[PDB]
């Protein structure tokens, strides 16, 4: 058991081991605040997320457990993986705080597209890495569901990692990347929900502006349908939701726009990919494993450096437990964590 030390960082008190030094706050995370640190043991610069009161409710505690179990499982270059987890608590009885430790990056794609000119190659590298993380993420029967720039951490030398996987109204940017099916509650939609979100990002990288900047769920669906066209009889009987199916029919039927006329001055191979990613019916979207083979990524595609993952155990998700039973489950995982080589 290492020595801990206390530091007041933005009205909240952090208690960390000696090995983490030079703590500077960075902003928001998923259900907590994040600090940057230098890990004197491994020599890496690391982001440390402290979870804010993780055991105050049942919905909180399960989510505390959910987040830690995801990261433990993730060992991939383009996916955020757990480097360490600790707690200042000495025993289960006093145990209340969880600090997660992962790799550190410069910013997400929100803070860069502003003051950058991005050559066709920048896109090639950036999208290839997303889909590479996705292929791996999806192989463990996991969906992100909320893929967007803000959760794609990025480097000076253009390296990329994915955050907030496995975890909303008006003129807000958190909705502009959603696949229409999950946005409007349609069906057992599948993994290819994230392939839509790519298509929307890639476009924004290629054009410098948002593809579907809707003012509400409806205004956005209309923007989407203007480009990709209105559903045929095939996709209608696939929507297993009464109210949604009823609304789609009532809409004036629109044909598919010519994709070359929208994203202009862009690589023809990039265009042909977007057509295969922005398909409305998610039984006909190109899969991650398939997307890497596309001739667009010809100079990066290395099949022997595109690994899949081991199946993820999600049987804990269908269990009704109390606070202290999620707490105990979590406690066990934290003290049983063994750091990488
Ligand atoms: C510390 C941490 C813990 C967990 C998760 C996570 O996604 N968990 C769910 C289960 C999958 C993410 C992070 C996490 C990692 C990194 C790396 N870099 N940056 C980062 C730093 C400055 C900046 F401007 C942008 C940035 F992305 C991170 N931020 C802001 C983070 O929140």
Tab-separated table of C-alpha atoms and ligand atoms in Angstrom:
chain	number	residue	atom	x	y	z
A	1	UNK	CA	0.000	0.000	0.000
A	2	UNK	CA	1.581	3.305	-1.182
A	3	UNK	CA	1.580	6.670	0.595
A	4	UNK	CA	-1.190	9.075	-0.351
A	5	UNK	CA	-1.204	12.892	-0.378
A	6	UNK	CA	-3.984	15.481	-0.269
A	7	UNK	CA	-4.501	18.431	-2.616
A	8	UNK	CA	-7.441	20.856	-3.020
A	9	UNK	CA	-8.256	21.085	-6.732
A	10	UNK	CA	-11.172	23.292	-7.623
A	11	UNK	CA	-13.247	23.078	-4.479
A	12	UNK	CA	-12.889	19.311	-4.347
A	13	UNK	CA	-10.172	17.396	-2.429
A	14	UNK	CA	-8.090	14.796	-4.309
A	15	UNK	CA	-6.142	12.074	-2.498
A	16	UNK	CA	-3.501	10.386	-4.684
A	17	UNK	CA	-0.306	8.240	-4.467
A	18	UNK	CA	3.179	9.840	-4.631
A	19	UNK	CA	3.684	8.395	-8.119
A	20	UNK	CA	1.219	10.934	-9.516
A	21	UNK	CA	2.723	14.414	-9.478
A	22	UNK	CA	2.147	17.816	-11.151
A	23	UNK	CA	-1.654	17.750	-11.044
A	24	UNK	CA	-3.340	20.255	-13.357
A	25	UNK	CA	-7.153	20.267	-13.934
A	26	UNK	CA	-8.429	19.934	-17.523
A	27	UNK	CA	-12.254	20.069	-17.326
A	28	UNK	CA	-15.161	17.668	-17.912
A	29	UNK	CA	-15.381	13.887	-18.023
A	30	UNK	CA	-18.098	11.246	-17.866
A	31	UNK	CA	-19.600	11.620	-14.355
A	32	UNK	CA	-16.579	13.335	-12.775
A	33	UNK	CA	-13.786	15.891	-13.144
A	34	UNK	CA	-10.384	15.172	-14.723
A	35	UNK	CA	-6.817	16.210	-13.883
A	36	UNK	CA	-3.637	15.760	-15.890
A	37	UNK	CA	-0.650	14.225	-14.092
A	38	UNK	CA	2.878	12.933	-14.556
A	39	UNK	CA	3.249	9.315	-13.422
A	40	UNK	CA	6.801	9.155	-12.082
A	41	UNK	CA	6.813	5.314	-12.098
A	42	UNK	CA	5.990	4.658	-15.779
A	43	UNK	CA	7.043	8.054	-17.157
A	44	UNK	CA	3.778	8.661	-19.024
A	45	UNK	CA	1.593	11.756	-18.760
A	46	UNK	CA	-1.819	10.557	-17.585
A	47	UNK	CA	-5.393	11.752	-17.150
A	48	UNK	CA	-6.951	10.963	-13.759
A	49	UNK	CA	-10.748	11.076	-13.394
A	50	UNK	CA	-12.202	11.351	-9.899
A	51	UNK	CA	-15.784	10.122	-9.752
A	52	UNK	CA	-18.123	12.512	-7.943
A	53	UNK	CA	-20.025	10.765	-5.120
A	54	UNK	CA	-20.313	7.487	-7.094
A	55	UNK	CA	-22.368	5.629	-4.448
A	56	UNK	CA	-25.126	8.157	-3.634
A	57	UNK	CA	-27.762	6.103	-5.537
A	58	UNK	CA	-28.461	2.721	-7.202
A	59	UNK	CA	-28.399	4.227	-10.719
A	60	UNK	CA	-25.015	5.831	-9.839
A	61	UNK	CA	-23.318	2.775	-8.304
A	62	UNK	CA	-24.208	0.425	-11.182
A	63	UNK	CA	-22.799	3.054	-13.532
A	64	UNK	CA	-19.632	3.306	-11.377
A	65	UNK	CA	-19.292	-0.461	-11.735
A	66	UNK	CA	-20.160	-0.295	-15.452
A	67	UNK	CA	-17.422	2.234	-16.287
A	68	UNK	CA	-14.630	0.383	-14.486
A	69	UNK	CA	-15.530	-2.978	-16.054
A	70	UNK	CA	-15.397	-1.456	-19.556
A	71	UNK	CA	-11.921	0.046	-19.142
A	72	UNK	CA	-10.439	-3.106	-17.553
A	73	UNK	CA	-11.447	-4.956	-20.696
A	74	UNK	CA	-10.107	-2.413	-23.186
A	75	UNK	CA	-6.535	-3.072	-24.333
A	76	UNK	CA	-6.214	-1.322	-27.714
A	77	UNK	CA	-4.191	1.568	-29.205
A	78	UNK	CA	-7.255	3.585	-30.328
A	79	UNK	CA	-9.516	2.829	-27.369
A	80	UNK	CA	-9.089	4.412	-23.944
A	81	UNK	CA	-7.800	1.681	-21.624
A	82	UNK	CA	-7.243	1.617	-17.873
A	83	UNK	CA	-3.661	2.210	-16.704
A	84	UNK	CA	-4.605	2.292	-13.009
A	85	UNK	CA	-7.426	2.569	-10.484
A	86	UNK	CA	-7.124	3.323	-6.792
A	87	UNK	CA	-8.946	4.523	-3.720
A	88	UNK	CA	-7.711	6.329	-0.583
A	89	UNK	CA	-10.103	4.167	1.451
A	90	UNK	CA	-8.377	1.493	3.564
A	91	UNK	CA	-11.310	-0.953	3.840
A	92	UNK	CA	-14.744	-1.607	2.255
A	93	UNK	CA	-16.330	0.139	5.275
A	94	UNK	CA	-14.758	3.575	4.704
A	95	UNK	CA	-14.683	3.179	0.865
A	96	UNK	CA	-16.422	5.976	-1.068
A	97	UNK	CA	-14.093	7.348	-3.783
A	98	UNK	CA	-12.807	5.974	-7.097
A	99	UNK	CA	-10.028	7.454	-9.171
A	100	UNK	CA	-9.511	6.071	-12.686
A	101	UNK	CA	-6.205	6.629	-14.532
A	102	UNK	CA	-5.775	6.486	-18.331
A	103	UNK	CA	-3.485	7.886	-21.073
A	104	UNK	CA	-3.378	11.650	-21.806
A	105	UNK	CA	-4.081	13.516	-25.048
A	106	UNK	CA	-3.936	17.153	-26.220
A	107	UNK	CA	-7.628	17.753	-27.009
A	108	UNK	CA	-10.682	16.226	-28.725
A	109	UNK	CA	-11.793	16.991	-32.310
A	110	UNK	CA	-13.943	19.865	-30.948
A	111	UNK	CA	-10.900	21.983	-30.079
A	112	UNK	CA	-8.961	21.427	-33.295
A	113	UNK	CA	-11.199	21.723	-36.364
A	114	UNK	CA	-11.413	25.397	-35.596
A	115	UNK	CA	-7.864	26.480	-36.335
A	116	UNK	CA	-6.572	23.693	-38.606
A	117	UNK	CA	-6.432	23.072	-42.343
A	118	UNK	CA	-6.801	19.320	-42.795
A	119	UNK	CA	-5.316	17.668	-45.892
A	120	UNK	CA	-7.039	14.643	-47.404
A	121	UNK	CA	-4.447	12.506	-45.582
A	122	UNK	CA	-5.316	13.936	-42.143
A	123	UNK	CA	-8.822	12.517	-42.700
A	124	UNK	CA	-7.451	9.176	-43.939
A	125	UNK	CA	-5.463	8.718	-40.725
A	126	UNK	CA	-8.206	10.088	-38.439
A	127	UNK	CA	-11.106	8.022	-39.765
A	128	UNK	CA	-9.000	4.840	-40.116
A	129	UNK	CA	-8.186	5.008	-36.400
A	130	UNK	CA	-11.829	5.542	-35.362
A	131	UNK	CA	-12.992	2.481	-37.353
A	132	UNK	CA	-10.003	0.496	-36.036
A	133	UNK	CA	-11.065	1.221	-32.445
A	134	UNK	CA	-14.659	0.454	-33.471
A	135	UNK	CA	-13.853	-2.915	-35.067
A	136	UNK	CA	-12.215	-3.845	-31.751
A	137	UNK	CA	-14.972	-2.271	-29.629
A	138	UNK	CA	-17.738	-3.986	-31.622
A	139	UNK	CA	-15.975	-7.375	-31.498
A	140	UNK	CA	-16.555	-7.445	-27.726
A	141	UNK	CA	-20.295	-7.046	-28.513
A	142	UNK	CA	-20.117	-3.394	-27.400
A	143	UNK	CA	-21.753	-0.328	-28.968
A	144	UNK	CA	-20.658	3.282	-28.309
A	145	UNK	CA	-24.043	4.840	-29.142
A	146	UNK	CA	-22.924	8.369	-28.613
A	147	UNK	CA	-19.944	8.817	-30.935
A	148	UNK	CA	-19.059	12.489	-31.501
A	149	UNK	CA	-15.952	14.736	-31.743
A	150	UNK	CA	-16.006	15.542	-27.997
A	151	UNK	CA	-15.138	11.904	-27.243
A	152	UNK	CA	-12.319	11.418	-29.734
A	153	UNK	CA	-9.114	12.461	-27.942
A	154	UNK	CA	-6.271	13.493	-30.231
A	155	UNK	CA	-2.531	14.308	-30.398
A	156	UNK	CA	-0.101	16.796	-31.950
A	157	UNK	CA	1.107	13.950	-34.192
A	158	UNK	CA	-2.518	13.118	-35.076
A	159	UNK	CA	-2.941	9.986	-32.910
A	160	UNK	CA	-6.515	9.229	-31.790
A	161	UNK	CA	-8.278	7.448	-28.901
A	162	UNK	CA	-11.992	6.840	-28.199
A	163	UNK	CA	-13.700	7.885	-24.925
A	164	UNK	CA	-17.125	7.396	-23.263
A	165	UNK	CA	-18.109	4.117	-24.993
A	166	UNK	CA	-20.774	1.772	-23.600
A	167	UNK	CA	-22.321	4.508	-21.459
A	168	UNK	CA	-30.461	16.238	-25.854
A	169	UNK	CA	-33.152	18.655	-27.113
A	170	UNK	CA	-33.035	21.977	-29.015
A	171	UNK	CA	-30.064	23.442	-30.911
A	172	UNK	CA	-27.342	21.294	-29.291
A	173	UNK	CA	-24.332	19.478	-30.805
A	174	UNK	CA	-24.670	16.239	-28.803
A	175	UNK	CA	-27.502	15.122	-31.139
A	176	UNK	CA	-26.056	15.998	-34.584
A	177	UNK	CA	-24.116	12.707	-34.877
A	178	UNK	CA	-26.771	10.233	-33.753
A	179	UNK	CA	-28.070	7.575	-36.092
A	180	UNK	CA	-31.764	8.338	-36.729
A	181	UNK	CA	-32.951	4.964	-35.376
A	182	UNK	CA	-31.647	5.384	-31.784
A	183	UNK	CA	-32.508	9.106	-31.851
A	184	UNK	CA	-36.176	8.263	-32.435
A	185	UNK	CA	-36.529	4.885	-30.686
A	186	UNK	CA	-37.042	2.330	-33.462
A	187	UNK	CA	-35.641	-1.175	-32.904
A	188	UNK	CA	-32.980	-3.643	-31.873
A	189	UNK	CA	-30.647	-1.409	-33.803
A	190	UNK	CA	-27.173	-2.717	-33.967
A	191	UNK	CA	-23.654	-1.900	-33.892
A	192	UNK	CA	-23.723	-0.055	-37.114
A	193	UNK	CA	-25.289	2.916	-35.279
A	194	UNK	CA	-21.709	4.133	-34.763
A	195	UNK	CA	-20.881	3.816	-38.473
A	196	UNK	CA	-23.497	6.530	-39.068
A	197	UNK	CA	-21.747	8.759	-36.517
A	198	UNK	CA	-18.489	8.307	-38.397
A	199	UNK	CA	-20.133	9.348	-41.690
A	200	UNK	CA	-21.297	12.533	-39.971
A	201	UNK	CA	-17.849	13.277	-38.531
A	202	UNK	CA	-15.885	12.420	-41.695
A	203	UNK	CA	-18.128	14.849	-43.594
A	204	UNK	CA	-17.474	17.608	-41.072
A	205	UNK	CA	-13.740	16.976	-41.539
A	206	UNK	CA	-14.148	17.075	-45.335
A	207	UNK	CA	-16.404	20.138	-45.540
A	208	UNK	CA	-15.537	22.105	-42.393
A	209	UNK	CA	-19.199	22.376	-41.307
A	210	UNK	CA	-21.788	20.103	-39.682
A	211	UNK	CA	-23.665	17.752	-42.020
A	212	UNK	CA	-27.025	17.682	-40.180
A	213	UNK	CA	-27.275	20.670	-37.804
A	214	UNK	CA	-30.939	20.175	-36.766
A	215	UNK	CA	-32.874	22.419	-34.346
A	216	UNK	CA	-34.813	19.450	-32.878
A	217	UNK	CA	-35.279	15.670	-33.372
A	218	UNK	CA	-37.729	16.363	-36.224
A	219	UNK	CA	-35.805	19.175	-37.952
A	220	UNK	CA	-32.770	16.861	-37.955
A	221	UNK	CA	-34.548	13.785	-39.310
A	222	UNK	CA	-35.801	16.022	-42.137
A	223	UNK	CA	-32.219	17.181	-42.856
A	224	UNK	CA	-31.148	13.532	-42.965
A	225	UNK	CA	-34.026	12.459	-45.214
A	226	UNK	CA	-33.309	15.319	-47.630
A	227	UNK	CA	-29.908	13.752	-48.350
A	228	UNK	CA	-30.299	9.992	-47.883
A	229	UNK	CA	-33.930	9.815	-49.121
A	230	UNK	CA	-37.162	8.526	-47.532
A	231	UNK	CA	-37.495	4.830	-46.576
A	232	UNK	CA	-38.783	2.238	-49.045
A	233	UNK	CA	-41.373	-0.444	-48.210
A	234	UNK	CA	-38.479	-2.674	-47.030
A	235	UNK	CA	-37.342	-0.478	-44.119
A	236	UNK	CA	-40.928	0.288	-43.040
A	237	UNK	CA	-41.744	-3.254	-41.851
A	238	UNK	CA	-38.380	-3.324	-40.028
A	239	UNK	CA	-39.329	-0.470	-37.698
A	240	UNK	CA	-41.053	-2.354	-34.878
A	241	UNK	CA	-42.343	0.778	-33.150
A	242	UNK	CA	-45.945	1.885	-33.733
A	243	UNK	CA	-45.761	5.712	-33.405
A	244	UNK	CA	-42.483	6.142	-35.342
A	245	UNK	CA	-43.537	4.000	-38.336
A	246	UNK	CA	-46.776	6.028	-38.505
A	247	UNK	CA	-44.920	9.341	-38.722
A	248	UNK	CA	-42.392	8.272	-41.383
A	249	UNK	CA	-45.224	7.357	-43.811
A	250	UNK	CA	-46.937	10.746	-43.386
A	251	UNK	CA	-43.844	12.500	-44.759
A	252	UNK	CA	-43.569	13.684	-48.375
A	253	UNK	CA	-41.361	11.104	-50.120
A	254	UNK	CA	-37.912	12.339	-51.189
A	255	UNK	CA	-35.241	10.783	-53.454
A	256	UNK	CA	-31.527	10.262	-52.671
A	257	UNK	CA	-29.354	13.338	-53.413
A	258	UNK	CA	-26.209	12.956	-55.523
A	259	UNK	CA	-23.401	12.725	-52.935
A	260	UNK	CA	-20.698	14.177	-55.204
A	261	UNK	CA	-22.586	17.503	-55.281
A	262	UNK	CA	-22.586	17.909	-51.478
A	263	UNK	CA	-19.014	17.199	-50.308
A	264	UNK	CA	-17.000	18.884	-53.024
A	265	UNK	CA	-13.271	19.085	-53.716
A	266	UNK	CA	-12.995	15.793	-51.831
A	267	UNK	CA	-11.435	12.462	-52.842
A	268	UNK	CA	-13.896	10.380	-54.982
A	269	UNK	CA	-12.965	7.321	-52.833
A	270	UNK	CA	-13.961	9.251	-49.699
A	271	UNK	CA	-17.319	10.085	-51.297
A	272	UNK	CA	-18.012	6.447	-52.195
A	273	UNK	CA	-17.318	5.487	-48.582
A	274	UNK	CA	-19.759	8.077	-47.160
A	275	UNK	CA	-22.493	6.669	-49.424
A	276	UNK	CA	-21.828	3.294	-47.818
A	277	UNK	CA	-21.856	4.768	-44.296
A	278	UNK	CA	-24.863	7.088	-44.536
A	279	UNK	CA	-27.244	4.334	-45.620
A	280	UNK	CA	-30.478	4.757	-43.672
A	281	UNK	CA	-31.302	1.062	-43.107
A	282	UNK	CA	-28.840	-0.230	-40.508
A	283	UNK	CA	-28.958	-3.742	-41.950
A	284	UNK	CA	-27.213	-2.278	-45.003
A	285	UNK	CA	-24.576	0.041	-43.494
A	286	UNK	CA	-20.963	-0.965	-44.067
A	287	UNK	CA	-19.456	-2.652	-40.970
A	288	UNK	CA	-16.194	-1.594	-39.299
A	289	UNK	CA	-14.332	-4.753	-40.389
A	290	UNK	CA	-15.610	-4.098	-43.939
A	291	UNK	CA	-14.827	-0.366	-43.877
A	292	UNK	CA	-11.077	-0.884	-43.337
A	293	UNK	CA	-10.809	-2.958	-46.525
A	294	UNK	CA	-12.253	-0.080	-48.566
A	295	UNK	CA	-9.647	1.239	-51.027
A	296	UNK	CA	-9.819	4.648	-49.312
A	297	UNK	CA	-7.547	3.477	-46.498
A	298	UNK	CA	-5.169	1.769	-48.961
A	299	UNK	CA	-1.984	3.271	-47.486
A	300	UNK	CA	-2.845	2.532	-43.822
A	301	UNK	CA	-4.806	-0.753	-43.985
A	302	UNK	CA	-2.528	-3.305	-42.319
A	303	UNK	CA	-4.681	-6.409	-41.509
A	304	UNK	CA	-2.071	-7.763	-39.050
A	305	UNK	CA	-2.324	-4.571	-36.955
A	306	UNK	CA	-6.149	-4.556	-36.845
A	307	UNK	CA	-6.941	-6.919	-33.944
A	308	UNK	CA	-10.301	-7.955	-32.513
A	309	UNK	CA	-11.081	-8.385	-28.790
A	310	UNK	CA	-12.189	-11.140	-26.406
A	311	UNK	CA	-16.002	-11.374	-25.795
A	312	UNK	CA	-17.193	-9.025	-23.015
A	313	UNK	CA	-19.238	-10.305	-20.062
A	314	UNK	CA	-22.429	-8.237	-19.789
A	315	UNK	CA	-24.521	-10.561	-17.573
A	316	UNK	CA	-24.223	-8.096	-14.670
A	317	UNK	CA	-26.409	-5.657	-16.628
A	318	UNK	CA	-29.598	-7.656	-16.072
A	319	UNK	CA	-29.371	-7.687	-12.248
A	320	UNK	CA	-31.304	-5.676	-9.645
A	321	UNK	CA	-28.944	-4.891	-6.761
A	322	UNK	CA	-28.691	-2.520	-3.796
A	323	UNK	CA	-26.055	0.221	-3.329
A	324	UNK	CA	-23.727	-1.792	-1.041
A	325	UNK	CA	-23.765	-4.819	-3.369
A	326	UNK	CA	-22.613	-2.726	-6.334
A	327	UNK	CA	-20.153	-1.042	-3.946
A	328	UNK	CA	-18.688	-4.388	-2.837
A	329	UNK	CA	-18.535	-5.640	-6.423
A	330	UNK	CA	-16.640	-2.494	-7.379
A	331	UNK	CA	-14.333	-2.547	-4.342
A	332	UNK	CA	-13.227	-6.050	-5.391
A	333	UNK	CA	-12.344	-4.912	-8.936
A	334	UNK	CA	-10.266	-1.931	-7.734
A	335	UNK	CA	-8.004	-3.851	-5.340
A	336	UNK	CA	-7.774	-6.775	-7.786
A	337	UNK	CA	-6.444	-4.576	-10.590
A	338	UNK	CA	-2.993	-5.498	-11.890
A	339	UNK	CA	-1.299	-2.820	-14.089
A	340	UNK	CA	0.044	-3.732	-17.616
A	341	UNK	CA	3.622	-5.156	-18.125
B	1	LIG	C1	-9.597	9.750	-17.367
B	1	LIG	C2	-10.718	9.037	-18.132
B	1	LIG	C3	-11.385	7.966	-17.533
B	1	LIG	C4	-12.411	7.303	-18.210
B	1	LIG	C5	-12.770	7.714	-19.492
B	1	LIG	C6	-13.882	7.022	-20.276
B	1	LIG	O1	-14.136	7.368	-21.430
B	1	LIG	N1	-14.522	6.051	-19.635
B	1	LIG	C7	-15.620	5.297	-20.264
B	1	LIG	C8	-15.695	3.812	-19.920
B	1	LIG	C9	-15.194	4.252	-21.295
B	1	LIG	C10	-12.104	8.780	-20.086
B	1	LIG	C11	-11.084	9.449	-19.416
B	1	LIG	C12	-10.464	10.506	-20.079
B	1	LIG	C13	-9.283	10.255	-20.774
B	1	LIG	C14	-8.643	11.284	-21.454
B	1	LIG	C15	-7.533	11.312	-22.173
B	1	LIG	N2	-7.377	12.559	-22.610
B	1	LIG	N3	-8.296	13.271	-22.204
B	1	LIG	C16	-8.361	14.560	-22.526
B	1	LIG	C17	-7.634	15.516	-21.817
B	1	LIG	C18	-7.715	16.856	-22.194
B	1	LIG	C19	-8.514	17.229	-23.274
B	1	LIG	F1	-8.591	18.517	-23.637
B	1	LIG	C20	-9.235	16.279	-23.986
B	1	LIG	C21	-9.150	14.941	-23.613
B	1	LIG	F2	-9.847	14.014	-24.298
B	1	LIG	C22	-9.165	12.573	-21.467
B	1	LIG	N4	-10.372	12.846	-20.768
B	1	LIG	C23	-10.980	14.200	-20.743
B	1	LIG	C24	-11.016	11.794	-20.076
B	1	LIG	O2	-12.063	12.017	-19.469
